[PDB]
Design a protein around this ligand. Structure first.
Ligand code: JC4
Ligand code: JC4
Length: 154
């Protein structure tokens, strides 16, 4: 099982930064929408749904410390969860060799000028993989989400 970010090197586990582009200006009462499906894609390394991979996001996925007061909802594979995650999410099965954009979005409500600083971590999303055959070769991933640009709110 592997993923990449913006079509870069293949990733089988571990921590990777994911750089996003956000609307530079938002109004009071407006949320930021981070569509991670545009950045992270994953696939099964055999194809044909041989040794199908089972992927979920993990309780403890959270905002960056600086943004701890923010509110959020996380969309994963047809379901929306409050963020930070206090439960794991549903499981997404991956079996094609052709990369699948991850069905992952984050909706962020700023609480408490600059609402997002360019270059700062926004959120840390933990992901778990286990496959079907043998031990399933469980793997842990972290996606550290970072904006390329600042966002301001009047
Ligand atoms: O385990 C890894 O860390 C890892 C494995 C592989 C890989 C490459 C070639 C063939 C099979 C591979 O892994 C198996 O894939 C199964 C179906 O997805 C299934 O996931 C199996 O459990 C798995 O062993 C690639 C990378 N990579 O980042 O390019 C990473
Ligand atoms: O090892 C497992 O069985 C397992 C691991 C994870 C996981 C994936 C990604 C990042 C962190 C993860 O678990 C945390 O690991 C901490 C120690 O490193 C620490 O042990 C935390 O308690 C733990 O939650 C998810 C699942 N899962 O089923 O979604 C299972």
């Amino acid at each position: 099982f592997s993923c990449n970010v913006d079509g870069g090197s293949s990733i089988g586990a571990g921590t990777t930064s994911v750089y996003v582009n956000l609307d530079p200006v938002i109004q009071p009462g407006q949320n930021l929408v981070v569509d991670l499906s545009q950045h992270i894609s994953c696939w099964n390394d055999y194809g044909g749904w041989y040794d199908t991979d089972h992927i979920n996001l993990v309780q403890g996925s959270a905002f960056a410390g600086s943004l701890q007061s923010y509110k959020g909802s996380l969309y994963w594979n047809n379901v929306t969860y409050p963020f930070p995650l206090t439960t794991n999410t549903n499981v997404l099965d991956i079996g094609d060799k052709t990369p699948m954009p991850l069905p992952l979005k984050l909706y962020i409500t700023p609480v408490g000028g600059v609402v997002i600083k360019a270059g700062e971590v926004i959120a840390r999303i933990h992901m778990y993989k286990i496959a079907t055959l043998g031990s399933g070769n469980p793997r842990n991933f972290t996606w550290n989400i970072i904006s390329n640009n600042s966002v301001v709110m009047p």
